[PDB]
Design a protein around this ligand. Structure first.
Ligand SMILES: Nc1nc2c(ncn2[C@@H]2O[C@H](COP(=O)(O)CP(=O)(O)OP(=O)(O)O)[C@@H](O)[C@H]2O)c(=O)[nH]1
Ligand SMILES: [Mg+2]
Lengths: 125, 264, 260, 121, 122, 124
């Protein structure tokens, strides 16, 4: 069990994994030069959380631009969530976006396509 | 298969027939028919087991194939999503560039563009020795256009001037909006002698324009001052000399085009 | 087997007894022995072909395994290369973003962009230790230009002053519109002695402007105050010193440049 | 007509055309149930009247039992050919996969009737 | 003593004369099944004919092609021959628990064996 | 049996010259449907490598490449690497403008797994 706090930069997102809340939050643009160094600890945190009990896990995303391996990492995380959901664990995801950029919402729809857990695409209002 | 059954049946009849019971070969045939049945069971068993092993291996291989296919998909999906992110980014960059370098009313290049290009052509002149010419054009009596027909009419007039000038320019020449009713022509890698004809075609283009505003068809003239870039001189001093030539055009009566040269 | 061996031998000895030749039980014994040999031959062949089939399957599975792991690495390589392309697209994006916070009238960086650079150069004034030169530049008697000729005209003078000052700067120098007729010039990693030539050139370029209004040509001049960043102070303090210098240049007439 | 599944081969016995065609993987569970008709169909045709019989095969994998049934069918074709009946077989295969072709030459070693092992892209 | 080292495609086999045990490990896709398994059958025959001391077989086999299954059935036949003649013989079959199907295949090997035939998870 | 794909604003210009034995591509590659664009290129390359043994040359003047495009280029490169490992003479020349700094190291990544002649060339 651990709290994860990765400070954002201008090229990499801020990430906060709150173990008591059961919440993984991410904010910002994601152009990491070393994608594994950013996201490996995150995927590991999600795995540890899922293995340590059956409390729910909610992802709270305020992500902007994602480069290719960020996209790949987000799908890896979705895969873990889809497996936990198939097995009875309550998991869920909120994807916030500025309403004035509605292409973003279609991008999120693409991430949601193969997810069967609650996956809410939400404008800031 | 047909024959093994036919044979076992024939043997069955032989072994049943009472005339053979007691023969020295009867009991032998019974024993050997039995032995053959056992060998047949052994053969089928072999096959069945073998079939079982191949079913196991197959199941494993179909599992691996399914993974492979998932991976393929994943790759195609990752690439697609990423492609879309990059298209959005591309559209954003295009709009921003458009807003910084193109003039909203006329579509022409703007001052920033011009300046930027003027810097890089001065550098090109330096190294390779190829100069450009600068023609600065100012609409004569534009204020009469605006006062008689409105500023929307003058705006149409400026659009038509822009279209006309761009139509008589070579493909690498640059016609920019320089001011409210001023335009800067940059002819790169061009000398005055070669500029003369192009410039005169540009001025014919503007002169013969007729912009319809309701019941009237407007015509205009432009003054224009033109210079050549003198090497060892900043692009701003080039612009200044083109501008002073424009001033002389304007003072000398309009619909004029004055060149500036250099007394040694 | 061994009982099967003994039975086959006993049977073959029976079959070799000519007294039974032709007898139906002899025929059936012979047919069953022959069918036994034939089944053994058939089995040898079946097993050989089947062995080959599953050898093929074994190699096909090993090939699919290799393909699967090469697929994993290919996804990682595609993503790596793509990320680098997108890094170039991002550098473009940030350039344009910063290139759109420009003074609408002159196209120069605005006050905000000036403050942002000022803070960035204050920090580099610490870590690398080379300070910057700050000049505050003001158009002389601009109010007269506006009163005589109009605001439109004044505005144009400012657009052309921006053109002329920008033309005389070196690669890393920065020219911004502080506000009104006031501009700010920033020369990073420079010190006054190197500054003088560039600042003379910038005043020249303002001096030799001949801005048309209709059929007349305007001449304008600029006063300018200059100083140096004294590290650890705030940009603000540095500005203020440049501003006091400029006020001194205006006190001593027009078209002047005092250092502080 | 036997519809193929993922583990069974698709089989078609054209009475008029005189053609037995077979396609796909063969890992049947109950091999007799599947291949006994085919053998019954084959011998019913061979006894019916002197029309030529052509086998059009593109099998992929054959388990042990399936190999045994294929040799039964080939035995029928051989005894037919020995009596003058015109019978032929052609085995197509993907060229990238040589291994199947030998295996097909293995099936052919005891056949004296037309047995063509044909590649395709 | 019989010792044949295992390959990528053939099993490691150890026939220990002193403890009286044949052990086999690995996959079995032999190119020449005769050359491989003939030595094994011969060793088993010579041991069974030499003198009433018990034979146990300790098999860690994985995949078996068709001719390998035939060779195994030959060997089991010789073991049941010895067993019905009073010779103490037996076998255990070791298999990975997570592979369901190896157990059922081993049972099918056992079905006509009357000597101790123990199938073993690990 | 040539291949001609005219180069739009968002998709590259592609010329497969059959008897010259040369695949040439120029421009940005942001294709909306990457299959439609590169499937005929991959088929053309496959046709050429199968039809005989004449040598194949890639000559590229490419600019920005989105992710599906990078993938397809790697597919093409895999075809070339396979033909090279079987004796076929194949070669690639990647042209870039020297101003772009980073382009070269992108190309170098493209070439890391390539045994055949892969030339990266600055061209002003
Ligand atoms: N319709 C538009 N009018 C403009 C635009 N920009 C400027 N103008 C008007 O241009 C008018 C041009 O004035 P200038 O002194 O040239 C006056 P005039 O045309 O009479 O020039 P000269 O003949 O050259 O003396 C001026 O009143 C501007 O306000 C514009 O974008 N659209
Ligand atoms: Mg005018």
């Amino acid at each position: 069990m651990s709290d994860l706090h990765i400070p954002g930069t201008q090229s990499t997102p801020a990430i906060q994994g709150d173990w008591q809340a059961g919440r993984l939050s991410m904010q910002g643009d994601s152009y990491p030069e070393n994608s594994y160094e950013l996201f490996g600890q995150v995927i590991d945190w999600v795995e540890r959380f899922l293995a340590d009990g059956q409390r729910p896990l909610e992802l709270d995303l305020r992500l902007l631009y994602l480069n290719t391996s960020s996209i790949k990492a987000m799908m890896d995380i979705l895969d873990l969530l889809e497996e936990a959901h198939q097995g009875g664990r309550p998991v869920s995801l909120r994807w916030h976006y500025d309403r004035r950029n509605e292409r973003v919402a279609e991008l999120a729809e693409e991430f949601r396509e193969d997810c069967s857990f609650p996956f809410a695409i939400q404008a800031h209002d | 298969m047909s024959r093994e059954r036919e044979l076992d049946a024939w043997i069955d009849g032989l072994l049943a027939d009472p005339q053979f019971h007691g023969h020295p070969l009867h009991q032998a045939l019974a024993r050997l028919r039995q032995q053959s049945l056992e060998q047949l069971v052994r053969l089928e068993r072999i096959a069945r087991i073998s079939d079982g092993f191949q079913s196991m291996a197959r199941e494993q291989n179909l599992s691996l194939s399914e993974r492979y296919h998932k991976q393929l998909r994943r790759l195609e999906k990752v690439a697609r999503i990423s492609d879309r992110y990059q298209q959005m980014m591309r559209d954003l960059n295009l709009a921003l560039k458009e807003a910084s370098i193109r003039d909203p009313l006329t579509g022409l290049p703007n001052r920033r563009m011009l300046l930027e290009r003027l810097r890089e052509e001065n550098e090109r002149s330096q190294r390779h020795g190829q100069s450009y010419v600068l023609a600065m054009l100012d609409v004569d009596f534009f204020k009469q256009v605006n006062d008689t027909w409105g500023h929307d009419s003058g705006d149409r007039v400026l659009v038509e001037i822009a279209r006309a000038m761009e139509s008589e320019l070579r493909e690498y020449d640059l016609c920019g909006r320089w001011g409210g009713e001023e335009f800067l022509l940059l002819l790169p890698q061009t000398r005055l002698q070669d500029a003369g004809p192009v410039l005169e075609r540009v001025r014919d283009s503007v002169r013969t324009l007729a912009v319809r505003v309701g019941t009237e068809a407007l015509s205009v003239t432009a003054s224009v001052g033109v210079t050549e870039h003198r090497i060892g001189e900043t692009y701003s001093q080039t612009v200044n000399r083109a501008d002073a030539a424009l001033l002389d055009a304007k003072r000398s009566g309009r619909d004029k085009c004055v060149f500036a040269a250099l007394p040694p």
